[PDB]
Design a protein around this ligand. Structure first.
Ligand code: NFU
Ligand code: SF4
Ligand code: SF4
Ligand code: SF4
Ligand code: FES
Ligand SMILES: [Ca+2]
Ligand SMILES: [Mg+2]
Lengths: 138, 447, 298
């Protein structure tokens, strides 16, 4: 009946490519996620993640280059500092830390992307839907 | 017939008076309702205890200083730190400046319209603008008094509305010698205008006595106020309670307030009904601020205010229970605060550079207390080892005058109303005049 | 011009700031007709044909909601007067708790409360709205004057612009331009995060650079930055700029980015989250109701 709504933010140089590799390899995974492209994980910040939850996201995924492999040298180091604060901000707002997932996935890591999507889907599916949007509509 | 005065005007906050009659046309029920609540006591849980003096001022825009200082005091107790003498002086200077602004605001902007025009049917005349058209000097002087008060708050507190200098251990900034000198020059004028205001009040309260409105809402009760060795003090001392006949019943350090004060709840109002815990709701009713503070004090700490106080005590006795006399006691306090501003500025320690002490280990509890312009103000915070608030209790001034307002408004209707035809605009305003005599701040009271 | 004022879930501070025009208030009232103002006059009902309406406070109860809609239908121009009306304000922190929790504390579990019956006032008092909401969430707002409270001069400039048939213009920059503190040409770099009581701040150097959480970077200018000038960090009471929806999110983004920036690749990203024990209170003191996630889910 219910299927989780997951939004993804993937950097063009690595994770977006890693998602493309999974596609070329026909590596199947659940159809809950809808990926948004950015040039760097450094583009991601709390406003975008929080905006996703307000709209109705049950889970939010962020994919970037491995630490030290950023196409723009160090954008992911900034995102990494932001996400750590964001995990705890979400808990204060009653949004489970586990509804947010960040991973470092390279341009050719299709298998990793596939398994990450499977694991994140099962985690959100087990948590059930996020009741934020319903509470805000009341 | 169900009449309702809503909103109560020329008061801070949201209040209303309901007046009801039975099927036979006789007066049945008269109640004072406060229709607002925000929940500061609960939402402060989880906050950094040092941010309390940033949040509590937002309880009220008139008396934000009192809250800033009551929180700062509770916070200093949570961090087990005794602040330097200079900080205490700067804090008290800010507090006295705020009291000048609050008392001037209430007497002239809110109360005077009724004292000047108690029998008019024109509401467009019964306000600040109406007084200004006939007597512009009265309002120009009121504006000067307020400006002076707010200037002291801005200089010592950084901001006239919601000061920010009372920090953990003391003050975040010192009063520069140049600033102290200018405030000291301007200080004489404030005392002068405050002294001129007492005569205005005498003359205006004489007009009230001529219309038999001096006894409106009269009832006897206990009275509470802060005293420093028996002397009137709005910043430091112990809380003294006197009975209706003037004998001292209690004298206690603010940290023990939970063993003396109790707060009842009624279904018709968001404002609680406090009382002396041991006496009960029937026999334990008490009042706070101006007249109550004068009633518990042996004397005023300033020379000019003491003369008007001694002259007043000889005429009306002690303790005085007249709600309308709170206006007069307010003016005495306005002068006393103006005098204290000069006294604190004349102290050489006011310009000192030792303004803050290092915070000590976190003591899980802290009670901060000051006499806000509208009554005893108590901020009580409980925290964890990291200084994160776990529980809080705020006994905010006007809440303690809630029973008096609910009783007084009833006594007014009993004296002037027998049938719905008697509930005329002037009589309904007499009920509001009683509420206004206590200088209620309902945002404060409910928090 | 016929103007009216009212207050909702605020503190009265904005009306007090209007009174802080002092001698200038009388000059303003000469060129304007004040037809409704509960704190100053006894006109009980909002009259028809109001031109400008200054609505203070956010939405906290059903009565505020009623009055907001009432003033909207009678006023031609509606102004969200102050940070509470514009963003929710400090009362907005109640959104971190259920209304039942707020009321139970105030009327049952506070230490001085004696209520054995456990009653919650429910007669002749309005029920609270599910959560604090900015004025714009319930009615169409034409303009807004940010600030907790807005400085008197800004309030006059806005009203005077409407009197002259001109469009009011709010300042657009963040607070650092106005702030008198010294900023490094090299840029901001934060080594450690301190609570306001920790350490002894340098009175000349920027407070954010010193490790204190100063909201000036994510807050609109206009106040004159009296807080850093008075020795304490900015708490962000003027709210965000026109280009930032969620003030707290942007402040967190900026802070996280410059934290350990001189040791960018090696700084432990766990230091900052562990250092801030109260994240919502640090970044959403005045704007929680206007944030993307404005409540704590229960
Ligand atoms: N004076 C005052 Fe407040 Ni607006 C009240 N009542 C606080 O303690
Ligand atoms: S904005 Fe600040 S000042 Fe204006 S009401 Fe809300 S709290 Fe009081
Ligand atoms: S102190 Fe706060 S406001 Fe002043 S510059 Fe540094 S950050 Fe900007
Ligand atoms: S400095 Fe920050 S907090 Fe202080 S007034 Fe300006 S905006 Fe409000
Ligand atoms: S480009 Fe992949 S994280 Fe910077
Ligand atoms: Ca309380
Ligand atoms: Mg806090």
């Amino acid at each position: 009946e219910w299927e989780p709504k997951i939004i993804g933010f993937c950097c063009n140089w690595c994770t977006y490519g890693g998602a493309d590799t999974a596609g070329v390899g026909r590596m199947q995974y659940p159809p809950s996620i809808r990926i948004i492209r950015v040039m760097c994980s450094g583009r991601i910040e709390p406003s975008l993640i929080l905006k996703a939850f307000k709209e109705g996201a049950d889970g939010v995924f962020v994919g970037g280059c491995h630490l030290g492999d950023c196409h723009y040298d160090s954008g992911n180091y900034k995102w990494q500092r932001r996400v750590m604060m964001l995990y705890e901000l979400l808990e204060e707002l009653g949004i489970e830390k586990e509804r947010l997932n960040h991973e470092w996935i390279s341009a050719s890591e299709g298998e990793k992307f596939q398994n990450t999507m499977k694991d994140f889907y099962n985690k959100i599916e087990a948590l059930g839907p996020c009741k934020l949007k319903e509470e805000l509509d009341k | 017939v169900k009449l309702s005065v809503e909103p109560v005007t020329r008061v801070e906050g949201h209040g209303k008076i309901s007046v009801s009659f039975d099927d036979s046309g006789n007066l049945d029920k008269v109640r004072f309702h406060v229709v607002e609540v925000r929940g500061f006591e609960k939402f402060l849980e989880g906050r950094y205890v040092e941010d309390a003096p940033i949040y509590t001022p937002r309880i009220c825009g008139i008396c934000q200083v009192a809250h800033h200082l009551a929180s700062a005091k509770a916070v200093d107790n949570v961090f087990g730190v005794k602040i330097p003498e200079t900080a205490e002086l700067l804090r008290n200077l800010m507090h006295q400046g705020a009291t000048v602004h609050s008392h001037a605001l209430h007497f002239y902007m809110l109360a005077a319209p009724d004292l000047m025009f108690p029998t008019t049917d024109d509401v467009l005349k019964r306000n600040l603008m109406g007084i200004a058209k006939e007597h512009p000097e009265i309002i120009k002087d009121a504006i000067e008094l307020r400006k002076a008060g707010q200037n002291v708050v801005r200089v010592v507190g950084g901001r006239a509305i919601h000061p920010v200098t009372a920090v953990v251990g003391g003050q975040s900034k010192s009063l520069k010698e140049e600033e102290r000198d200018e405030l000291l020059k301007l200080s004489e004028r404030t005392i002068e205008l405050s002294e001129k205001s007492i005569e205005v009040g005498k003359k205006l309260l004489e007009n009230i006595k001529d219309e038999d409105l001096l006894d409106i809402g009269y009832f006897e009760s206990a009275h509470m106020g802060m005293v420093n060795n028996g002397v009137h003090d709005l910043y430091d001392g112990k809380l003294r309670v006197v009975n209706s006949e003037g004998k001292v019943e209690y004298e206690f350090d603010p940290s023990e307030y939970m063993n003396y004060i109790a707060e009842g709840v009624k279904p018709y109002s968001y404002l609680k009904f406090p009382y002396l815990k041991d006496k009960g709701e029937e026999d334990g009713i008490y009042r706070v601020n101006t007249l109550s503070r004068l009633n518990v004090s042996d004397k005023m700490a300033t020379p000019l205010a003491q003369k008007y106080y001694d002259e007043f005590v000889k005429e009306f006795g002690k303790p005085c229970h007249h709600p309308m006399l709170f206006h007069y006691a307010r003016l005495i306090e306005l002068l006393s605060s103006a005098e204290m501003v000069k006294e604190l500025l004349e102290n050489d320690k006011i310009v000192g550079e030792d303004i803050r002490a290092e915070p000590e280990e976190v003591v899980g509890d802290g009670v901060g207390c000051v006499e806000a312009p509208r009554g005893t103000l108590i901020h009580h915070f409980k925290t964890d080892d990291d200084g994160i608030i776990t529980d809080t209790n705020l006994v905010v001034a006007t809440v303690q005058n809630n029973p008096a307002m609910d009783i007084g408004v009833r006594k007014v209707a009993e004296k002037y109303i027998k049938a719905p035809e008697d509930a005329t605009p002037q009589v309904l305003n007499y009920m509001e005049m009683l509420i206004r005599a206590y200088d209620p701040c309902l945002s404060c009271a409910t928090h | 011009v016929k103007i009216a004022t009212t207050w909702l879930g605020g503190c009265s501070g904005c009306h007090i700031s209007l009174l802080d025009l002092h001698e200038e208030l009388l000059n303003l009232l000469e060129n304007v007709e004040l037809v409704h103002c509960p704190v100053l006059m006894d006109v009980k009902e909002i009259p028809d044909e109001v031109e400008v309406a200054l609505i203070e406070g956010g939405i906290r109860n059903e009565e505020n909601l009623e009055i907001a809609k009432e003033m909207r239908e009678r006023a031609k121009i509606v102004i969200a007067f102050g940070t509470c009306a514009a963003f929710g304000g400090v009362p907005g922190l109640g959104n971190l708790y259920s209304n039942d929790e707020l009321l139970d504390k105030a009327y049952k579990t506070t230490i001085t409360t004696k209520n054995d019956d456990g009653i919650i006032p429910n007669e002749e008092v309005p029920e609270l709205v599910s959560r604090v909401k900015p004025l714009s969430e319930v009615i169409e707002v034409d303009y807004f004057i940010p600030g907790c409270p807005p400085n008197p001069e800004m309030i006059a400039e806005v009203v005077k612009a409407l009197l002259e048939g001109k469009e009011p213009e709010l300042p657009k920059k963040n607070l650092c331009e106005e702030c008198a503190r010294k900023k490094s040409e090299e840029g901001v770099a934060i080594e450690t995060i301190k609570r306001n009581y920790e350490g002894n701040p340098d009175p000349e150097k920027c407070l954010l650079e010193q490790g204190y959480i100063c909201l000036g970077i994510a807050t609109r200018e206009g106040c004159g930055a009296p807080c850093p000038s008075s020795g304490v960090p900015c708490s962000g009471c003027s709210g965000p700029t026109d280009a930032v929806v969620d003030q707290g999110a942007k402040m967190i983004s900026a802070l996280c980015s410059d934290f350990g920036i001189d040791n960018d690749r090696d700084v432990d990203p766990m230091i900052l989250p562990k250092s801030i024990k109260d994240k919502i209170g640090s970044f959403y003191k005045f704007t929680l109701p206007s944030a993307f996630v404005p409540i704590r889910l229960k």
